[PDB]
């Protein structure tokens, strides 16, 4: 009815310690979502096209020519870590549990309220907001996954991360097909490389409508749309990292010279010279058995061509990297490549009392030591002589192709059958929770953006829309735009994500690294005098585990 509430706000994370080792984490989350009517009730096909930044020869990577379909439907996305967990509750998954997997997911919409604004204006500019008890809210849940899957944490457009703050849904859109060609260049090319937007190939044309594919529920003011519980099937996510590269695997060499006075320059020594040692080498024709050339069971991590921009039917793109290296060789300005950089606004982690256009960024440096340091690689000849000459080694200093800023390790790939690598860690609060596996035949082993990948089916996307409140002067035969009563809707959303995590144990003598609060970050976790909140990023793989 009109004056009967249809739900309950619930925003508490509930740890149910079930049988030996395992916890049932039920993360409740509920928001107040503010939705106003779309600017147009049509499906446009807008082509985004810049020839001012990619037409200048030298920046091909500034290309964002695409074609898309802007829909009147909004998207209530909840696929980010901070929608569910406050920073005091990362804190208790992240240094108490060891692995973690994803169980179920629910979604509801309750206490729907639609209001119309109408200015009176004898001479104020003032507005009157009165309830519409018969206006409807159109809700469509794509439970069959017919729509294009557009995960909205890659654009930092999710529900907000604070429970006491109202949020907005995102004006859903999807990629239409286009063809284009961008021939690369630099600042000194002669002539003009081609920059043509061809059009749309009429075999890959796909125009989706929410009306023809989804059953839409029209929620009035007393109405509640609860979806089911979607049970996932994913692999478990490890909350522990690996410190071992391909140089700390196996049996160390027998130091038969041990340091007699403990200190900082008292090194132990292997008493055997390198050409007289025993062990398995894979180098075939050399008698040197050192720590670099001793045979390992596999290879940990891989090298990839960094800042390599491939091309395809519809423009250039960057090849993704799975890589992370924490502290030793990374300086503060350029840590690595392949470690993600997030940008976000005041709703999603920036301080809510900063007036500005620019977002807030961090670069997530993972704790897993599985990446590569390309300045320490070298390709040398098969003869393997004592100190190697210049025509028998390929350093990262010499030019490849004549370019002094391009060496061989910019095009180097050592993905092989012996490469072992780890999944991506969670990124609190901005990373995705779950992604959708590709509908190809040979699926990738990783997704760079989410730790959980739903193989068979993903949760259905929830689309909301304000039903058209028309005025009395309407006819569908005029080419001019439709005239509507200006309506907006404030409904309440509530999700419930269930995890299942395993409590960590103490294997080693020494204490491991734990996420804490201290003097230099005590003020990221409390408000500040105006109500300015923020959620700073936290690491997710704090504890170490042995790879071998």
């Amino acid at each position, epitope marked *: 009815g009109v004056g009967i509430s249809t739900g309950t706000f619930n925003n508490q994370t509930e740890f149910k310690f079930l049988e030996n080792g395992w916890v049932e984490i039920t993360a409740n989350s509920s928001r107040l979502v503010h939705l106003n009517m779309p600017e147009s009730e049509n499906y446009r096909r807008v082509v985004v096209n810049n020839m*001012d930044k990619t*037409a*200048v020869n030298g920046n091909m990577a500034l290309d964002d020519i695409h074609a898309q379909i802007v829909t009147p439907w909004s998207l209530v996305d909840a696929n980010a870590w901070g929608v569910w967990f406050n920073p005091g509750d990362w804190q208790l998954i992240v240094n108490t549990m060891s692995e973690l997997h994803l169980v179920s997911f629910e979604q509801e919409i309750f206490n729907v309220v639609l209001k119309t604004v109408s200015e009176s204006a004898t001479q104020p500019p003032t507005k009157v907001y009165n309830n519409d008890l018969t206006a409807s809210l159109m809700v469509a849940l794509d439970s069959n996954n017919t729509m294009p899957f557009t995960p909205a944490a890659m654009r930092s457009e999710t529900l907000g991360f604070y429970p006491w703050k109202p949020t907005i849904p995102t004006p859903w859109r999807y990629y239409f097909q286009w063809d284009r060609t961008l021939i690369p*260049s630099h*600042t*000194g090319t002669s002539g003009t490389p081609t920059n043509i937007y061809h059009g749309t190939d009429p075999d890959d044309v796909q125009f989706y409508t929410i009306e023809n594919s989804v059953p839409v529920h029209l929620l009035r003011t007393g109405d509640e749309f609860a979806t089911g519980t979607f049970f996932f099937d994913c692999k478990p996510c490890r909350l522990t990292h690996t410190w071992q590269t391909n140089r700390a695997l196996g049996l160390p060499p027998f130091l038969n010279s041990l340091p007699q006075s403990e200190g900082a320059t008292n090194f132990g020594d292997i008493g055997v010279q390198q050409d007289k040692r025993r062990g398995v080498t894979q180098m075939g024709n050399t008698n040197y058995i050192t720590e670099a050339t001793i045979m390992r069971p596999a290879e940990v991590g891989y090298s990839a061509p960094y800042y390599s921009f491939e091309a395809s039917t519809q423009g250039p793109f960057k090849t993704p990297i799975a890589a992370g290296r924490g502290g030793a060789q990374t300086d503060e300005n350029q840590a690595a490549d392949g470690n993600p950089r997030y940008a976000f606004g005041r709703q999603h982690g920036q301080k809510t009392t900063t007036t500005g256009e620019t977002p807030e960024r961090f670069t997530y440096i993972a704790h897993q030591d599985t990446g590569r340091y390309p300045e320490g690689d070298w390709i040398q000849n098969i003869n393997f002589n004592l100190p190697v000459t210049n025509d028998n080694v390929l350093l990262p200093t010499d030019p490849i192709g004549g370019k002094t800023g391009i060496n061989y390790t910019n095009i180097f790939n050592t993905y092989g059958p012996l490469t072992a690598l780890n999944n991506v860690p969670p990124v609190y609060p901005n990373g995705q929770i779950w992604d959708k596996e590709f509908d190809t035949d040979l699926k990738p082993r990783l997704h760079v953006n989410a730790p959980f990948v739903c193989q068979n089916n993903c949760p259905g996307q929830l689309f909301v829309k304000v039903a058209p409140n028309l005025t009395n002067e309407y006819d569908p035969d005029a080419s001019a735009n439709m005239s509507r009563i200006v309506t907006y809707s404030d409904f309440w959303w509530k999700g419930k994500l269930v995890f299942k995590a395993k409590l960590r144990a103490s294997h080693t003598w020494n204490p491991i690294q734990q996420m804490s609060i201290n003097v230099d970050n005590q003020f990221n976790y409390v408000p500040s005098n105006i109500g300015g909140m923020k959620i700073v990023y936290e690491k997710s793989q704090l504890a170490p585990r042995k790879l071998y």
Partner: antibody, heavy 119, light 108 residues
Framework: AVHLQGTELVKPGASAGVKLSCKASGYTFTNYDMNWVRQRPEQGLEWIGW???????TRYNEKFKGKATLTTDKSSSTAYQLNRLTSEDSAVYFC?????????????WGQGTLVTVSG | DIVMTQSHKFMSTSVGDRVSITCKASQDVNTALAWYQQIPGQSPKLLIY???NRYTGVPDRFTASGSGTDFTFTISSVQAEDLALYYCQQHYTTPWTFGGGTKLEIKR
């Protein structure tokens, strides 16, 4: 038909700034950034910075950081430049646009707008 | 910041001759160099871009060459309207820096 139209010759005092202008014509304004070039009669030509009218992406050089700020006025096809300090910088200020090629070699310039700062 | 040095401030020319204006850069620009002609009191005019290519409508007596640090500008038959200030600009990296300028003048 592409044509740039600088403002008239200004006479400021040596305390404040005076805004210059350059109305573009004969081409779509948003496809090309407007570069500003200063020509002192002693120092040759000096590039100040560009401004894309596509949501205002500026660059400058380091000797013109707090010295001049570039804006544009969309839907009127004109550019601007404040020249905030204006101490000894009496020169001809040029309004340059790239051209058909793609390299940063200015094909269409303005007519020049002489600033004369003095006491 | 690449500094650009032109080899002469003034080059004595006869009408009908062959003049070689030279610009030398500090850092190795690949071709990345534009040539400008400015009669004084007027806006400069783009003649050469990318150190070899002629702009559309520029007459064919102006040729240019060079790659690396040494560049040259050539007028095969110097005429009356070719005696101006000749400028050298690099479109390699930001900030774009101009040359010192070279004034073609009459051999007295």
């Amino acid at each position: 038909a592409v044509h740039l139209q600088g403002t008239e010759l200004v006479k400021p005092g040596a305390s404040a700034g005076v805004k210059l202008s350059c109305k573009a014509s004969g081409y779509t304004f948003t496809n090309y950034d407007m570069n500003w070039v200063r020509q002192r009669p002693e120092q040759g030509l000096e590039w100040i910075g560009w401004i894309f009218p596509g949501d205002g992406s500026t660059r400058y050089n380091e000797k013109f950081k707090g010295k001049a700020t570039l804006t544009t006025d969309k839907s009127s096809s004109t550019a601007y430049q404040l020249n905030r300090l204006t101490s000894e910088d009496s020169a001809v200020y040029f309004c340059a646009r790239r051209g058909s090629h793609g390299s940063y070699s200015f094909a269409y310039w303005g007519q020049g707008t002489l600033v004369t700062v003095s006491g | 910041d690449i500094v650009m040095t032109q080899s002469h401030k003034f080059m004595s020319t006869s009408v009908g001759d062959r003049v070689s204006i030279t610009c030398k850069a500090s850092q190795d620009v690949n071709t990345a160099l534009a040539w400008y002609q400015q009669i004084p009191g007027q806006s400069p005019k783009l003649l050469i871009y990318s150190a070899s290519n002629r702009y559309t409508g520029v007459p064919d007596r102006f040729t240019a060459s060079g790659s690396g640090t040494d560049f040259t500008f050539t007028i095969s038959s110097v005429q009356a309207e070719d005696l101006a200030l000749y400028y050298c600009q690099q479109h390699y990296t930001t900030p774009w820096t101009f040359g010192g300028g070279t004034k073609l003048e009459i051999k007295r």
